[model samples]
Target: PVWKDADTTLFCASDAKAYETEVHNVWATHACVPTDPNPQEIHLENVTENFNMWKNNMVEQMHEDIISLWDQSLQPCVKLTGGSVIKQACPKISFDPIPIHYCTPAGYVILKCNDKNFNGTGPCKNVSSVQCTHGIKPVVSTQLLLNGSLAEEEIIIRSENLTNNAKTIIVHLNKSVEINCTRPSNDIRKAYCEINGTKWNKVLKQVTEKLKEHFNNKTIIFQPPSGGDLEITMHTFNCRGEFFYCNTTQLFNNTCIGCNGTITLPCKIKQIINMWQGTGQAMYAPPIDGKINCVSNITGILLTRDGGANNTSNETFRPGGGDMRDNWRSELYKYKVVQIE
Candidate 1:
């Protein structure tokens, strides 16, 4: 069998059986045995079996740590050599066979993906599905912000990427805090949220629900903090924005560990607590009639590009500048949390 290189310019024959491709050079090499006189192809019916069969084969081939590199891989590549030649994720290209007759003389024919020997629908639908789910998994990002001027209380969770279908993501908490509201204002109010009257854990439960509301498949569970555990907290401010307090848990992330013994950032709690507006001064700075108000924007910025402790860097709140608004009014805050890294 002959072995073809990336651009199709290079070839090495094992005389009989030797393999090459990285996961291109795969598992580090891109060489596969070519089948001449390619056999009959599958009906172009756009079947899921055809999609699954070919897909599962290659996916089963990838390591857990590298499966993401193989997703949505079937992009329309530019050249034949070096630079990602074929769509690594496409069942047709990655799993099927040919390198387009124009691109190859039949070079890297592992299974004979030719017009003469191939399967259903084609890259049309298959590529579409892959592209839709390309982000890899667990690629979650979160933020910590304050809510509840008085009765208003902690966190903001916007699980946008989850809706985008990112497979993997890392959560870094610059402020994996919000509580151990453990030190509630009066003394012991749980650092939790209320949905339709039921109090729930803000960092875990409520945040998960917020993501589920956006992502749909509920019972949401956020990527647990690398070094998290506000336990359960409560605050002082009444439903009218009167109290504020907390324990600094942001630095806890500095103590978390990753796979290779790497230090991971702590996950922040973007709590979103709500209270029924009674009849006092609303807590929020903008506008509210009853006792319900978010006293503070509960905002802050990344101080000194943090990723560790000691800088003991306290963020300088943007003071309503870069903070998210209440969708209706900029001043009428709705507890916002912004996350990027």
Candidate 2:
């Protein structure tokens, strides 16, 4: 029996018009011997056609992989930190130099106190009779010590000559300091300090969540062949793994390590042709020797070239005089209407 069911119609666009065409040349042959009651027959078809079917499936799969890779490679990592404030208190005395000390993220400084005699009659005398003056200045020191102690000092204030004083002077100090160990912010110069090493963890968690979402959206399926069956096995390619690797690499190299690497093969695809064989029977077939139908929906701007000397351009609703080439004519010639009733 001759099986004549495999057929397909393809539409091509040319010169602002659509041309419909059909292709139907798939065939197979089986031979039997006379004395054999049940003779085994073998048939073969063009492998290129099978390959084309696989190719289309692969293209669709790869498109999805490409999209996943983009999401992974383009996401951002943001680091956040908390703020801290430091405060200290100082003492006062009669003409006594008080040393006010404080520490910052950079280093420590010693504030000096001195008496500037505006009315010189013994600068350490009564407050109403004599003029007393004092000022604070940061002392240059390499060691991170306060109050001249060997142990690590949080804060300390020192003063001398507190005897024979009627009233006491109160010294106050308050300021906020920040130390940024992460990458520089937009301003760059400002310190990006973290309160308790939480910035790195926060940023890493954010990246992890985004990666999880990217993987969950991607799905893949693979169909295996049965024993002694010549059916085409289907394979689906999802880009979750590719996207995860790409994004991870981008974050580690470009943003974290500050290095560049090769980024190729952006998409994933289904269908491993070597492992699957197309069955001689057609699963889905189209009608032969029928009128090929054409349909299209498109909307865009129409432009026309100006032949005048000024060379001014104008836009119009309808375009004119554009020739389109019909390249699929040879493929369409394979199918001819032999009989019509």
Candidate 3:
């Protein structure tokens, strides 16, 4: 496809404003790296690659594959292993150098892998994982060393080379890793994250416990419908696998007033939606209406703008005046209203 450019949102400010916008070409450049204000760790299992080889020429052509990866803030590590190799056909299989350009804002890359030396007897083994800080350039030199004199000089294979020749290779990862996840801001309040159900429930429990401790012995008063929830304010939200995270904060006032202040509770609901639904002709849950849906980056979960999900419903009550930290409690009645029945 030809290159195309368009204006896109850079990131969301803490004030919930997406003021930064820039244009990027759609061909080689990605729209944006999936980022989260409330970033969290997630565990992935048994991730494999899908091979895109040419038909009718599989036996004649040699397939060499290399996987290039970049890391986010969580600093994930990956271990790749050879899927399988037949003893009779000791084909020279090479796992090329995982060139990772580690950037400061580009997050952390921790790779762990062992080089495999083809002895011409059987398949390669003893490979571990790899770590990348500056850059991990482990070039695997495979050869049929039966006579000990480089049988295959240097079978170099570059991704661009494969593209030019209309051929590509896919190698199965067949490993597990813990990496950062991207949760769509639009779906933050939906309470329907099904990717990690078991962990999500635990997160919800933690939020409830934390909020209860924050508001101990205090009655949480809820205003009628349409009013901002002073109790259920959104604090921190993240996810792990199918789980979600939330927290609360207390807004304190400094005045000669001395207000006891109010508490911000975590907002959450029961889990919903299974992204992997049915089989073969698989199906996915439709996006929640009114929310802008951005396709997932590494984690495959749909993402969207933050939409102020991690904020308190109403403005914090920081009374206007002198040092009233202790006296602020008395001023709370001023914002309350008495409704006639």
Candidate 4:
């Protein structure tokens, strides 16, 4: 037999061998030899035998399983990013996702977020839920006069660069401060609130500076001395044309006029206390219903630009000009504390 190719066929031959010129025949048998054929195209769906197939076969299936899991994770899940909602505090405020949901293969995912760093106790890795919330800033919009007055006092809360879908906001101090705000719609960005009423004024006085307020289950924080410049109007006086008593020659003619016409002035308790602190004496001058003397020796009701002999009231029992008014008509007269306006 002739050799056809080195990879497929084989041939063997032997010379005639006989002691007496006899021809001997020899041949090679090619039985059960593996016929290595040309490379054929095979697909994974067909070949099913496995001896050395574990590596590539198992690797391919694992790759497909990983891809299948990733595709399933693309389903949408409710994630708490930033938004607003209300329960009962009657406030609309920006809130953080407390327990947020994350997409998973088996089912939905959940997490808890309470503190600053959105962390929680759960098997979930990165998830958060809405529990604590914040996001409104307040400013003192009402003009704060050098002297504290609340005739037009108000506070303005602004929705800064944060999530907000609020409709109403109610403020709180040691107690409820009143309706913090109300919007015609959620589209409104800012809310305006006012501070007034005797009760409110009394409350504000308690926390003089850096007043912290609670709103929407969160602290209402912002710039400005919240209650620093707050003052309560202790009393009001409308002194009609009144002639003060006098016992001196010059005063008998002029009669020591207290205040000419209706001179209205608000009596601030703070102002009275401060006056007493500076004068080193607690006295209300120009005796209420007794002998009033215009004598310069009498320390009459007067305000000084600077006390301690730099200068005191030059006119006794008389409001020549400015916001000075007789304190007798006000409630301060009953208290008989250091009186001035």
The most accurate candidate by lDDT is: 1
In the order shown, the candidates' Cα RMSDs to the true structure are: 25.0, 44.4, 28.8, 42.8
lDDT for 121 in candidate 2 is 14
Q: Which digits, one per residue and each the tens of the lDDT, describe model 1 over residues 216-261?
A: 4433222222332232121122222222223223222222212222
Steric overlap count per candidate = 70, 4, 28, 10
lDDT of 4 at 190: 20
Global lDDT of each model? 0.23, 0.17, 0.20, 0.18
Report the C-alpha displacement of residue 179, candidate 4, in angstroms.
Answer: 3.3
Ranked candidates (TM-score, high to low): 1, 3, 4, 2
Whole-structure CA lDDT of model 4 = 0.18
Off by over 4 Å in 4: 1-174, 209-341
Per-residue CA lDDT of model 4 for 14-86, tens digit only, reads: 2212232211111001111112133222222321111111111222322332233322221112221223221
Give me the displacement of residue 97 in model 3, in angstroms: 28
Per-residue lDDT value at 241 in model 4 = 9
Q: Write the per-residue lDDT of candidate 3 for residues 1-341, one digit (tens) a residue.
A: 11111111111111111322211111002322222335322222332211111221111111111111111111112211133321221111211122222111222211211112221112223322111122212121110000011112211111212113221211111111112223345335543212222332332233223323333423222112122222112211112212122222221111111322232223342133111111111111232334322111111010011122224332111111111110111111011111111
Q: Where in model 1 is the C-alpha error above 4 Å?
A: 1-55, 64-219, 223-341
Expressed as tens digits, the lDDT of each residue in 5-89 for candidate 2 is 1222211111111121100000000110112123222222321111111112222322232233222222212211122222222
Ranked candidates (lDDT, high to low): 1, 3, 4, 2
Q: Between 3 and 4, whose TM-score is larger?
A: 3
Worst 10 residues of 1 by lDDT: 127-136
